[PDB]
Amino acid sequence: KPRLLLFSPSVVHLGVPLSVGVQLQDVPRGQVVKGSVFLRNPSRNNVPCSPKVDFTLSSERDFALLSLQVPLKDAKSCGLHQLLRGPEVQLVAHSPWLKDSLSRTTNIQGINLLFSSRRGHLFLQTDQPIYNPGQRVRYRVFALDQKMRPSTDTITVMVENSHGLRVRKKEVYMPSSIFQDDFVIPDISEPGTWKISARFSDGLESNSSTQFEVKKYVLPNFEVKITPGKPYILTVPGHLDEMQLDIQARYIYGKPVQGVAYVRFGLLDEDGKKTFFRGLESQTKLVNGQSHISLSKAEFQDALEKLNMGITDLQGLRLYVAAAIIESPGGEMEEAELTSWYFVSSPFSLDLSKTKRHLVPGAPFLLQALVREMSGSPASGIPVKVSATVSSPGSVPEVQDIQQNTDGSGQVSIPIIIPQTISELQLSVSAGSPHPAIARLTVAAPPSGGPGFLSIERPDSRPPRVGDTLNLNLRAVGSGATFSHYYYMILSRGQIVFMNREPKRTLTSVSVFVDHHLAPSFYFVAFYYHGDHPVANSLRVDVQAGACEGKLELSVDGAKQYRNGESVKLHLETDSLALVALGALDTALYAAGSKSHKPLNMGKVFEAMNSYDLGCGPGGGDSALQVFQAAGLAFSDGDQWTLSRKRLSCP
Amino acid sequence: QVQLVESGGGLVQTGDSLRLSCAASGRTFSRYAMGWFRQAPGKERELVAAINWSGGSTYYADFAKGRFTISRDNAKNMLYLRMSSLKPEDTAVYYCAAGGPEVEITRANEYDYWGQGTQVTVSS
Amino acid sequence: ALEILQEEDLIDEDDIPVRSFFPENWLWRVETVDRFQILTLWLPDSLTTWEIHGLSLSKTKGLCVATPVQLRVFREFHLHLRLPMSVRRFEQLELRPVLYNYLDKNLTVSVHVSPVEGLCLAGGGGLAQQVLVPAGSARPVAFSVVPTAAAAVSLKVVARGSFEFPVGDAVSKVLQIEKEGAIHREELVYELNPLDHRGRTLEIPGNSDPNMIPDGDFNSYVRVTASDPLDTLGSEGALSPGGVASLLRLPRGCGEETMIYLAPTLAASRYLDKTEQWSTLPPETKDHAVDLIQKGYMRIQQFRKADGSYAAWLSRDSSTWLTAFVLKVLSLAQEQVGGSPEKLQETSNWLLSQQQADGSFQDPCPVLDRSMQGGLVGNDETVALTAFVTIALHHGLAVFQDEGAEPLKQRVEASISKANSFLGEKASAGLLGAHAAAITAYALSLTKAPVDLLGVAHNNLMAMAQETGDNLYWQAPALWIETTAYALLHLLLHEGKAEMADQASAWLTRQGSFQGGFRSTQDTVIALDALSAYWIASHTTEERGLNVTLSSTGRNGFKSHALQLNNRQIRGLEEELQFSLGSKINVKVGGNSKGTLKVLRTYNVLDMKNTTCQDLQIEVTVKGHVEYTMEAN
Amino acid sequence: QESRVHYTVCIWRNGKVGLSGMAIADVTLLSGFHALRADLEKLTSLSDRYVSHFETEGPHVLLYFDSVPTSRECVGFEAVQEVPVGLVQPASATLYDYYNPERRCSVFYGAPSKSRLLATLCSAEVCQCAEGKCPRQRRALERGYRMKFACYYPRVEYGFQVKVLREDSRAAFRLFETKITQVLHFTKDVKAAANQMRNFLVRASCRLRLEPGKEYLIMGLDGATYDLEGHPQYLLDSNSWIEEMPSERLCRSTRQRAACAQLNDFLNEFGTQGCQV
Ligand SMILES: *[C@@H]1O[C@H](CO)[C@@H](O[C@@H]2O[C@H](CO)[C@@H](O[C@@H]3O[C@H](CO)[C@@H](O)[C@H](O)[C@@H]3O)[C@H](O)[C@H]2NC(C)=O)[C@H](O)[C@H]1NC(C)=O
Ligand SMILES: *[C@@H]1O[C@H](CO)[C@@H](O[C@@H]2O[C@H](CO)[C@@H](O[C@@H]3O[C@H](CO)[C@@H](O)[C@H](O)[C@@H]3O)[C@H](O)[C@H]2NC(C)=O)[C@H](O)[C@H]1NC(C)=O
Numbered sequence A: 001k002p003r004l005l006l007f008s009p010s011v012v013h014l015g016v017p018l019s020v021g022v023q024l025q026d027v028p029r030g031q032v033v034k035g036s037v038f039l040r041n042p043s044r045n046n047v048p049c050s051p052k053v054d055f056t057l058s059s060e061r062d063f064a065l066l067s068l069q070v071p072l073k074d075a076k077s078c079g080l081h082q083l084l085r086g087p088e089v090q091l092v093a094h095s096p097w098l099k100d101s102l103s104r105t106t107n108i109q110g111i112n113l114l115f116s117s118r119r120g121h122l123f124l125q126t127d128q129p130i131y132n133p134g135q136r137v138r139y140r141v142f143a144l145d146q147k148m149r150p151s152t153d154t155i156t157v158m159v160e161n162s163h164g165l166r167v168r169k170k171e172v173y174m175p176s177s178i179f180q181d182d183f184v185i186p187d188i189s190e191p192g193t194w195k196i197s198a199r200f201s202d203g204l205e206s207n208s209s210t211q212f213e214v215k216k217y218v219l220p221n222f223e224v225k226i227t228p229g230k231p232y233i234l235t236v237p238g239h240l241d242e243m244q245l246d247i248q249a250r251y252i253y254g255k256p257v258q259g260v261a262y263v264r265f266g267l268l269d270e271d272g273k274k275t276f277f278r279g280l281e282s283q284t285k286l287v288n289g290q291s292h293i294s295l296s297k298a299e300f301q302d303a304l305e306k307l308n309m310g311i312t313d314l315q316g317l318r319l320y321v322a323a324a325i326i327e328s329p330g331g332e333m334e335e336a337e338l339t340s341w342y343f344v345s346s347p348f349s350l351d352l353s354k355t356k357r358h359l360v361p362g363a364p365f366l367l368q369a370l371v372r373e374m375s376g377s378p379a380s381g382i383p384v385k386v387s388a389t390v391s392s393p394g395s396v397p398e399v400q401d402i403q404q405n406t407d408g409s410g411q412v413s414i415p416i417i418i419p420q421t422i423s424e425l426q427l428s429v430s431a432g433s434p435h436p437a438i439a440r441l442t443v444a445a446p447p448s449g450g451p452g453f454l455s456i457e458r459p460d461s462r463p464p465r466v467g468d469t470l471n472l473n474l475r476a477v478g479s480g481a482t483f484s485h486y487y488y489m490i491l492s493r494g495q496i497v498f499m500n501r502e503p504k505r506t507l508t509s510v511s512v513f514v515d516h517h518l519a520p521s522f523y524f525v526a527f528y529y530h531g532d533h534p535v536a537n538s539l540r541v542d543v544q545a546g547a548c549e550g551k552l553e554l555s556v557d558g559a560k561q562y563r564n565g566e567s568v569k570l571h572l573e574t575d576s577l578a579l580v581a582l583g584a585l586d587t588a589l590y591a592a593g594s595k596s597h598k599p600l601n602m603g604k605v606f607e608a609m610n611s612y613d614l615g616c617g618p619g620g621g622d623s624a625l626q627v628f629q630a631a632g633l634a635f636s637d638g639d640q641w642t643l644s645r646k647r648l649s650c651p
Numbered sequence B: 001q002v003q004l005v006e007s008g009g010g011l012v013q014t015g016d017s018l019r020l021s022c023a024a025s026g027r028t029f030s031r032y033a034m035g036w037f038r039q040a041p042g043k044e045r046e047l048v049a050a051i052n053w054s055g056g057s058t059y060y061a062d063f064a065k066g067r068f069t070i071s072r073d074n075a076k077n078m079l080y081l082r083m084s085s086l087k088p089e090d091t092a093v094y095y096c097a098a099g100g101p102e103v104e105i106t107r108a109n110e111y112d113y114w115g116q117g118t119q120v121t122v123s124s
Numbered sequence C: 001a002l003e004i005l006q007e008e009d010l011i012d013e014d015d016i017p018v019r020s021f022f023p024e025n026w027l028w029r030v031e032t033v034d035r036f037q038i039l040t041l042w043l044p045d046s047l048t049t050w051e052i053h054g055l056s057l058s059k060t061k062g063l064c065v066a067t068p069v070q071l072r073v074f075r076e077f078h079l080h081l082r083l084p085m086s087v088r089r090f091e092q093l094e095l096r097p098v099l100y101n102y103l104d105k106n107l108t109v110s111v112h113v114s115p116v117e118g119l120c121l122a123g124g125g126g127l128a129q130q131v132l133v134p135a136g137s138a139r140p141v142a143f144s145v146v147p148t149a150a151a152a153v154s155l156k157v158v159a160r161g162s163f164e165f166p167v168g169d170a171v172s173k174v175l176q177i178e179k180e181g182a183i184h185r186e187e188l189v190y191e192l193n194p195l196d197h198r199g200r201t202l203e204i205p206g207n208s209d210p211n212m213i214p215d216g217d218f219n220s221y222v223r224v225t226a227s228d229p230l231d232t233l234g235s236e237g238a239l240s241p242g243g244v245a246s247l248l249r250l251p252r253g254c255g256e257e258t259m260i261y262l263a264p265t266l267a268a269s270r271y272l273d274k275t276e277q278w279s280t281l282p283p284e285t286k287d288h289a290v291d292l293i294q295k296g297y298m299r300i301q302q303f304r305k306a307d308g309s310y311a312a313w314l315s316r317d318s319s320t321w322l323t324a325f326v327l328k329v330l331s332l333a334q335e336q337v338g339g340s341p342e343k344l345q346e347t348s349n350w351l352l353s354q355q356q357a358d359g360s361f362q363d364p365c366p367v368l369d370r371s372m373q374g375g376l377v378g379n380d381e382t383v384a385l386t387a388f389v390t391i392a393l394h395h396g397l398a399v400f401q402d403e404g405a406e407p408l409k410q411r412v413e414a415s416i417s418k419a420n421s422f423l424g425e426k427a428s429a430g431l432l433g434a435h436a437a438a439i440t441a442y443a444l445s446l447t448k449a450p451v452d453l454l455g456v457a458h459n460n461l462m463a464m465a466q467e468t469g470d471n472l473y474w475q476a477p478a479l480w481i482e483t484t485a486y487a488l489l490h491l492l493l494h495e496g497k498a499e500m501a502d503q504a505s506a507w508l509t510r511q512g513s514f515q516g517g518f519r520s521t522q523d524t525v526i527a528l529d530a531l532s533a534y535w536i537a538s539h540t541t542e543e544r545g546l547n548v549t550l551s552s553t554g555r556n557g558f559k560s561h562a563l564q565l566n567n568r569q570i571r572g573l574e575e576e577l578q579f580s581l582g583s584k585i586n587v588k589v590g591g592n593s594k595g596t597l598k599v600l601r602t603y604n605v606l607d608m609k610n611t612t613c614q615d616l617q618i619e620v621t622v623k624g625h626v627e628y629t630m631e632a633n
Numbered sequence D: 001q002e003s004r005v006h007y008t009v010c011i012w013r014n015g016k017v018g019l020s021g022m023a024i025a026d027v028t029l030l031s032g033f034h035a036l037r038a039d040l041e042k043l044t045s046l047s048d049r050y051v052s053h054f055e056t057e058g059p060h061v062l063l064y065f066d067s068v069p070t071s072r073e074c075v076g077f078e079a080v081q082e083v084p085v086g087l088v089q090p091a092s093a094t095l096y097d098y099y100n101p102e103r104r105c106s107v108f109y110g111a112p113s114k115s116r117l118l119a120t121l122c123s124a125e126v127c128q129c130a131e132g133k134c135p136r137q138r139r140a141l142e143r144g145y146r147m148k149f150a151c152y153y154p155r156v157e158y159g160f161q162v163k164v165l166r167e168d169s170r171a172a173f174r175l176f177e178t179k180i181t182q183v184l185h186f187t188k189d190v191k192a193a194a195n196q197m198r199n200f201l202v203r204a205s206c207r208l209r210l211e212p213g214k215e216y217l218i219m220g221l222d223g224a225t226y227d228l229e230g231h232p233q234y235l236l237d238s239n240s241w242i243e244e245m246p247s248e249r250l251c252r253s254t255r256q257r258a259a260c261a262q263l264n265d266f267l268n269e270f271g272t273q274g275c276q277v
Helices: A072-078 A297-306 A603-612 A625-631 C255-274 C284-297 C320-332 C341-345 C347-353 C381-395 C406-427 C434-446 C451-463 C480-494 C501-511 C522-537 D037-043 D146-151 D257-272
Strands: A003-009 A011-013 A018-025 A033-041 A053-057 A063-068 A088-094 A108-116 A121-126 A136-144 A155-160 A166-172 A178-184 A192-200 A209-214 A222-228 A243-251 A259-268 A274-276 A282-285 A290-295 A318-327 A333-338 A348-351 A365-373 A383-390 A398-405 A411-416 A424-431 A437-444 A453-457 A469-477 A485-492 A495-503 A508-513 A521-530 A533-542 A552-555 A567-586 A633-635 B004-007 B011-013 B018-024 B033-039 B045-051 B058-060 B068-073 B078-083 B092-099 B118-123 C030-042 C049-058 C062-065 C069-072 C077-081 C093-095 C097-101 C107-113 C129-133 C138-140 C143-147 C152-160 C168-178 C182-192 C201-204 C221-225 C545-554 C557-566 C573-575 C585-589 C595-605 C616-623 D004-013 D023-028 D033-035 D051-056 D060-065 D073-075 D078-081 D093-097 D104-106 D120-123 D126-129 D158-167 D173-185 D197-203 D215-220 D241-244
Touching: A003 A011, A003 A088, A003 A108, A003 A495, A018 A033, A018 A053, A018 A088, A018 A495, A033 A063, A053 A063, A063 A495, A108 A633, A108 C284, A121 A192, A121 A209, A121 A603, A136 A155, A136 C062, A155 A178, A166 A178, A222 A318, A222 A333, A243 A259, A243 A318, A259 A290, A274 A318, A282 A290, A282 D051, A348 A424, A348 A437, A365 A383, A365 A424, A383 A411, A398 A411, A453 A521, A453 A533, A469 A521, A469 A533, A485 A508, A495 A508, A521 A625, A533 A625, A552 C049, A625 A633, B004 B092, B018 B033, B018 B092, B018 B118, B033 B078, B045 B068, B045 B078, B058 B068, C077 C152, C077 C168, C097 C107, C097 C129, C097 C152, C129 C138, C143 C152, C182 C201, C221 C545, C221 C557, C255 C284, C255 C320, C255 C522, C320 C341, C320 C347, C320 C381, C341 C347, C347 C381, C347 C406, C381 C406, C381 C434, C406 C434, C406 C451, C434 C451, C434 C480, C451 C480, C480 C501, C480 C522, C501 C522, C545 C595, C557 C573, C616 D023, C616 D093, C616 D104, D004 D023, D033 D037, D037 D051, D146 D215, D146 D257, D158 D197, D158 D257, D173 D257
Parallel strands: A011 A108, A166 C573, B011 B118
Antiparallel strands: A003 A018, A003 A633, A018 A063, A033 A053, A033 A088, A088 A108, A121 A136, A136 A178, A155 A166, A155 A192, A192 A209, A222 A243, A243 A290, A259 A274, A259 A282, A259 A318, A318 A333, A348 A365, A365 A411, A383 A398, A383 A424, A424 A437, A453 A469, A469 A508, A485 A495, A485 A521, A521 A533, A552 A567, A567 C030, A567 C049, B004 B018, B018 B078, B033 B045, B033 B092, B045 B058, B068 B078, B092 B118, C049 C062, C049 C069, C077 C097, C093 C143, C097 C138, C107 C129, C107 C152, C152 C168, C182 C595, C201 C585, C221 C573, C221 C595, C545 C557, C545 C585, C616 D004, D004 D073, D004 D078, D023 D060, D023 D093, D033 D078, D051 D060, D093 D104, D120 D126, D158 D173, D158 D215, D173 D197, D215 D241
C-alpha cells in the first residue's frame, strides 16, 4: 500500500545535472523518510558514476525536485566508456525505508536509463554559401551549454571535403566561446559540398555542422525569379486551374532589367527525368522587369496528345518551367528554374498530428488540426466538417457531424463527445469547400479493466506567448475517488523543470506560468492513484514566442540611397555586455548557387532547443506506463516499472 | 612597406590657414586608404579627417566639418589637408596614417602604416 | 554630315575615382559592445545590395541573432565589367564593359582601356572609342583583347564624359590567365595491407610524361581510406533474460544442497554482468543478487573445518572434489564479497595434502548426490578429478595476495606442474573420454602448460567433433551440454571467435532455450561461464592504427609526411603533400588494418585540337565603307 | 542626311548528331552602329520567315530561330552610323542552343576592308603582340641623335648593324632574312656573333619599303619569338630606330665628313662600352 516514486528523463546527458524527482505516496502522518540517490554502474560491482545527493521527505512535504550532478571524471572511472552493446545506465535511489518497514527484499529502488555523451549547443556559420576553387574560407563557431549561456569547454573542429575526407583539424580552447579560422580551397578541386564539424573533446556524440558549396562561377549582375500566380494546379476532371506565371527579373542593386525573356516548358517526375514540350515556347520582352506569361488551356491538352497522355494521367508529377533571359544591350544571361509547382488533388493540406490518441472514454475527444495552403502559409476562415462514427460495443453505430471554422493560423479545436465503453473510434474529417481534403483515422480504446481514467482539457486553445498564465482543468473519470491529491510536473527540453501538487476539489484547476525556461515546447504530465495502481494522462502545449531573451538590432539609418565608397555608420544595439559577430554578405551570391543555401536565422536556434526533447507524440496513453515513456520519463513504484527505450526511434 | 613623410606645420596665430602635405613612397598607394590624425600633449590619438583609397568620398570629424578639407592625388602619391580658421585648442602633433579598405574610422589601432607626425602650434 | 562628335572636350581621367575593390564578403569582425556601439566603415566599389547579418553572444541574456539589413548601393552612371571565369594565354577574348545610364540626359562618353604590359590591345592601348548613350538606356563598348603573360594582368577600363555634363566611371580589375595546356588527373590506386607482407613497404614510380608542359606543374595530393567496418550479422545471441533471472536462488540445505543453488546463482550473476542484461530487469534485482551471495559466502563458513577441508556435514569425512568446487566459487566471489583472504589460502592447503606420487588426485570419499558432479561420473573419473582441481587452483591463484602466501604459491604451481606431467601423459596417450578430454585441455591452457603437451590435447579434442545440419556439438540431451561447454571455453583461448566456435556457441544457446533452461548443476554453471566469455569475444572489435609514411627528394630537398588514420570515426584523410616533381618517392606502411591508398597527381597536358564549333555553326560577313578617325599610314 | 551599310548573316548546323532544338542568335554590331528596325521585321512577316521574334537596343541584335538546317540559310539586314569609329577591331557573335544554353558557338568577325583577327607574330609555341602605328624609315642627313635614343628614352635593348638579303611574305607580314655585320649591345640573345641568320619582320599593311643588299642600322627592343632555325627573332614597330647606313660615296664627301663622324663614333662608344659613359 505505501509507495516510493522515482522520476527522471529517459536519456541522461553526461556533464549535465540530471533532474531527479522523488515522491512519497500513501504514507501515514507522522513519518519521515531519508536516503540518497545516485547513478550506479552494474557489472563493475556497484561503483557509482556520480556522487550521491541526500533527500529527506516528510509526510506534509512529500515531494522534492533534485539535481543530481553528473561529472565526467566519475563517469569514466566507473566504466561506462568501456561498456559493450549499447549506452545504458541505472539511476538508483538508496533508502533503508524499503527494507526496515515495507519488508521488501532490498533497500534499493530504481529505474533503467540510457546515457548520452551529447551535451551543449554548437552553432557555426561560414564566410559564404558558395565559393570558387582557390578562395579563402572563413568560419566561426559558437560554444554554448544546456542553459543557453556561453561555455568554456575545449572543442575539436574538423573540415571534410567534397568526397568526405578530413583535410584540416584543430583542437582549441574556448576562453571567449568563439573560434575564427581560415583555410583555402585547392585550385583544382572538384565541385561539391563540404562539411565543417565541431565537437567537444570529452563529448563524443556532439553532432553540429553546416555545409557550403564549391562551384566554378562568375558573379551575376541580376537575379531571375519565377513566381506563379498560385503554388498549385487542380486536376479535377470538371475544372482546371489557370497556368499563369510572372517572371520578375531585376538587378541586384535594385533597378529592373531591360531584356527579353526566353521560356521553355516541360514536365518532371519524382525520379528527375525532364520531359520538355516541343513547340509552345515563349519569348517575351521585359517591361518594368516583369514578364507575365500565360499557357492556354487549348495549348495544354494539345501537348499531352504529342506525349500520348491525358488529364487523368496527372495524378503525381509537377510542371517544369525553365527560364533564361538575356540582357538586351548587355549580352549577359542568367538562368532560373521552377521545380515546386505540383499537380494536386486539393488546394488545402491536412495536419492532424496535433490530435492526440488513446483518449479516455467518458471524456471529450479533442480533434485539433492544422489547415494550410498547398505549399504555402496556414490559411484561416476555412470550414472543417468532421463525421465521427463510433463503432459497436454490442449496440448500433451512431454518427455525429460537427462543423467549425479555423480560428488563427489554421488552428481549429473541435471537441466531440465520447461516452463510456467505446470499442474504437473512426473519423472522417472533411475540410474546405469546394474540392475538400480528406483524412481517415482509427484510434483504439483502453482495455476493459478500468483502474480509473484521467482527463486533461484546455479551455484557451490559443498558443500562448512567454508571460501568459495558462489554466488547465483536471477531472478523475470512471472510478471511486479514494485519492486526496493530484500531482503534476512540467517537462521541457528533456529535463524536469517544475514539480508541485494541487488539492482535489469540485471543479479542480491549476495555473501554469509559461516561462522562458519552458522552450517552444513543454509537456504537462499529471497523475493520481486508485489504491496501488497508477492513472495518468499527458498533453503537449506548444509556445508561439519566437523572441530572444535579450535583443540584437542592426540598423543603417537615413533614407538609404548610398553611393559606393561613402561612410556608413552601422548602429549596434544590445541588452547586455555581448560579443557581436558581424558579416556583410553579397546578395548576388544567392543567384549563382545551383541549390540556394539557407543560412542561420533565429528559427534554427529554437529548433536546436527541442533536439533534447525526449517525447514522441501529442501525449496520452491507454496505460499509465505508456503516458510516462511517451513523455520521456522513467518510473518505478516498486511493482510497475518502465522499460528502457531504444534511442529516439518511436515506432 | 609603403612609407609616409609629413611636412607643412609650424608656428601660427589664431584664425589663420595652413596647407599640410603627406608624401608617400611605394607603388601600391591607391590600394590603401588614408587619414589625418592628431594627438594632443597629454591625450591620445583622435581623427581629424579621412579619405577613401579611390578618393571618391571623404569623412570628417564633428569639429572638422567645414573648416578642414582633405584631398587625394593618386598620380603623385600625395595627401593634402587644406586647413582654415584655427583655434588654440587645435595644437597637436598631426599624424598621417595608412590603412586597408575594410578598416574602421574611429579605431586608431586598426590602421596599418604611419608617419612621424608634424607639429602645428596655434597661439593667441 | 551625320558625324557629330566631341574632340578633347573631356574630363581629366584622374578626376574619376577608379573602382578597384570588389569583394564578395566583408565586415568580418567581432566587436565587444557595451549596450551601444557605432562602427564607421567604408563601402566597397561593387554595385549590388548587401545583406548584413549579426549574432549577439552575451553572458547574461544568451544567444540572439539579428534581422538582417538590406543595404543598397547605386552609382547611377557606371560601367559593369563582368569577366569570364578563366581565359588562356594566346586565346583572343572579347571584354564587354556595358555603360549604364540611369539619368535623363543624352550623354556622350569616350571609353578606352589603359595599356598594361601583358595585353595586346587594338592600336597598342592608346586608342579610345566614343559612343553616345541615351537617357535611361544602356550601351555596350566591345574590346577585342588577346593576353600575353602567364600570371595575372591588372587591366583598367576608363569611361569619361564631356564638360557639358561631367559624367565618368573607371573599373580596374585583375584578369586571371590560365596556364598553357589542359588539365590532367592521374590516379595511382594501391590496395593497402600492412598486415602479412603484401605492402609493408613499397615504392611508387615517377611520371616523366612526354606530354608534360615543363613549367605547368600543379600540386599532387594523397588520400587514404580504411574501408573496413565490422558486420554485426554473426552474433544473434538472443538468450532469454528471464530464465536466467529464475536461477537467482537462495541457498537452502546442507553443503551439497547449497552449491546446486549458490553456484548457479553466481553463474547467473556473472553471466548477466558480462552480457550486460541488467537493463532488461529492475536494478533491485542486482542488489538482491549481491545479498544472496553475501549471505551465502559466510553460510559455507559454518561448514568450514579447521584445516580447509569441506564436506556436506561436520560429522561426514571431507571430499576432495567438493573442496575444489567451493574454492572455485569463493575465489570468484572475492570481488563481490570482501571476505578473509587467508582462510581460502588454507583451503587449498588441504588439497595439496592429497597429492599422489605420480601427479594424480584421489578422492577418499565422494559426495552423496552425484548429479551435482554432472558428467564426471564414468570410466575416466581419475582424469576428471585431476583436471578439475587444476581449474580450481588457477581461479584461487588470485586469492594468494602479497608475499605472505607466495612461498606457498610456489608449492601450488609445483603440484600443478607435476599434475601437468600426469595430465599431459594421459592426453598424449590418446583414447580419452568425451567429457574427460574437454575438462583436461581447458585446464592445461589456463595454468600455462608446455606447448608440445598443450597442442596434442588440442588436436585430440578437435577430432571428436561430430556435427550435423548447421550445428556443431559433442530433443535436448542433458549430458552433452557440459561437454560442449568445457570445449567452448578452451577454443576461445587458441582461436578466439573461430569458424567453428561461432556455430558451436549457437548450438547450446538453443539447448538453453528449452522450457526450464538447463537441467542439472554443471551444465548450468560452466555454460553460463562459456557463453559469457563468447559474448565479450564477439563484441570487442578494435582494429586500428594504419601508420603510413611517405618521403621524397627533389626541388624541395628532402621532405616527408607521416600520418596515422584510424580512430574508426573518420572515413578518410587527405593532405597537401608538397613533394618535388613526378620523381623519387618512398612509402613505409605500418598498423594492422585494411586500407586503400590513392595518389592524385595533377599536371598540365598537351594542347591538341582546338575543336572550333563542330556541332553548331555561325558566320557573318559585312561589306561596305565606314568612316574612321585617327589611325596611321 | 543619313548613311547606312549592309550585313549578311549565314548560319546552319551539323548537329543532327548533337543537341537539337531551336536557337537564339546573339550578335554584336560595331562600336557606333545600331540596327535598322524595319529591315529586321521583314523576316517576321514572311511565310518562310525563319526569324520568329526580334528585339534590338543599340549595337545588339537578338533573333529567335525556330528551325536550323544542314544547308546554307542567309538573312541580311542594315545598320546606320552614329559616331565614327576610332579603332580597327573585330566583334563577336554567339549562337546559343535554346534548350541547352551551355552548348553554344562564338565566332569572331572582322572589318570589311581589314582582316578578322588581331595582328600577332606566332612562331614556335610563343606569340608576340604586333600593334602600334607603323615603323618609319628615317634618313636623317637628307632630313634627335643616336645616344639619346639608345640609353635614356626607350632604353634600347639590342644594338646591331646588319645586311638585308631576302624579302619573304608570310601571312600578314613581310619577313627579311639578314646577316649580322657588327654586334653592339645585347640583352636577350647572349650568344649573338657576326654572320648569323636573323629574321626581321614588319607589318604587311604598312608602307615600309626595305632595300635588299644594303646595310642598315636597326636598334630597338627584344622579342619573345624565335625563328624557324633557332635564333631569337626581332620585330620592327614603334620605338624602333630604322636608319640606313650611308654609302662610301657619301661619307668620303666633304659636306658629310663631320656628319658621318657622329655616326661612326656612336658605333665605338656604344659597341665596346655601352650605356652610362
Ligand atoms: C552524426 O555524425 C555521424 C558521423 O559523425 C553522421 O552520420 C551519418 O551520415 C550519413 C550521411 O551519408 C547518413 O547516411 C544516409 O543514409 C541514407 C540511407 O539510410 C541515405 O538515404 C542518405 O542519403 C545518407 O547517405 C547516416 O544515416 C548518418 N548516421 C549514421 C548513424 O551513420 C552524421 O553527421 C550525424 N548523424 C545523424 C543521423 O545526424
Ligand atoms: C535624346 O535623343 C533622342 C533622339 O534619339 C530624342 O528623341 C526624339 O524626340 C523628338 C521630339 O521632337 C522626336 O521628334 C519628333 O519626330 C516625329 C517623327 O514622326 C514628329 O512626328 C514629331 O512632331 C517630332 O518632330 C524624335 O523622333 C525623337 N527621336 C526618336 C528616335 O524617336 C530625345 O528627346 C533626347 N532626350 C532629351 C532629354 O532631349
